[PDB]
Symmetry: C3
């Protein structure tokens, strides 16, 4: 079970055509044709404190998952299925919107987000994923 | 014709009285009496990539233009008419909410936003302008 | 009387359990047990210009004060009482949502936000305080 305790981090990806124009703050873009399985999207920093004896976890917003997939979502509820992996090779489990660390205790590092399955038929626009910090108990 | 492809950048101006207090992050402010033709408001970064053969463009939100003017808007739909100019002297055309580059191809730089006509009669408040990246076809 | 003129600064504090996980952009967290009187929460920059003859001022959102207290507020309407103090020792007055400088004129500095009274029973979540610039007549 996830218990919320911590802050929420936003990850944004804008799906574009091959010609694209970035305006203002620099944020990630990928052309439709580049939405292939395992394509890197972004990284999010994660730091777990005061967690001796407990397993660090992230929870996706309910706008970002269903029973089978984690996904970034557009303003029109278009969905880009994605997957999470810690960059340090540490062991985590994903299911039902929760990404939780196998070994307990403090940890700091980064979680990579990548495309989960070929999705070149998805539309252009801004997609967002919110992940909230907390811990997992059994 | 504007084809959406790219990200959106927001530009903000707070119109104030002569005595004004900036709280938090530093942002652009102008007293009502300083809303004179050609007064600089801000600049926004713009980068066109993958655009061989195509003209870079920006599109304003529908509640940032009308048939004659581009404008920043307050929460009460007050309109501060503004104009756009690439800071490197490159040639662009403005019409009907679209700012599009004359020469096709990749380009990066900045677009300056300035007051378009003396407007010292406009009220205090926060005014915003959103510009979305894409390209122009004929 | 407060007259609005200037910008708004948001200050956020996330109240956590003892084990907590910070994700993405760094913002302030404190565990419930750390909500002790005088605990530092944050600082906010404040710059007054064009204010010859007028006193610089901040106004809290209506959701952020009552006759007795200034407070950060959660989306569940929980209240964390806080207090303001300029970091340079300058003299300001707080009352009924307005923090205004005793000496008129231009000034640039920072205002510290701290916990006002022991409040270790407050619930977890994101608490916000919005302060808007202006001047006092």
């Amino acid at each position: 079970t996830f218990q919320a305790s911590g802050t929420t981090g936003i990850t944004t990806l804008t799906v574009t055509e091959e010609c694209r124009v970035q305006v203002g703050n620099v944020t990630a873009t990928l052309a439709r044709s580049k939405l292939k399985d395992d394509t890197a999207i972004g990284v999010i920093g994660v730091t777990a404190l005061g967690c001796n004896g407990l397993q660090a976890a992230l929870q996706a917003d309910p706008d970002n998952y269903d029973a089978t997939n984690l996904y970034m979502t557009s303003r029109n509820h278009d969905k880009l299925n994605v997957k999470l992996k810690a960059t340090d090779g540490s062991s985590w489990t994903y299911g039902n919107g929760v990404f939780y660390k196998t070994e307990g205790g403090n940890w700091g590092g980064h979680v990579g987000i990548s495309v989960d399955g070929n999705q070149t038929d998805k539309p252009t626009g801004e997609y967002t994923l919110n992940l909230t910090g907390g811990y997992w108990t059994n």
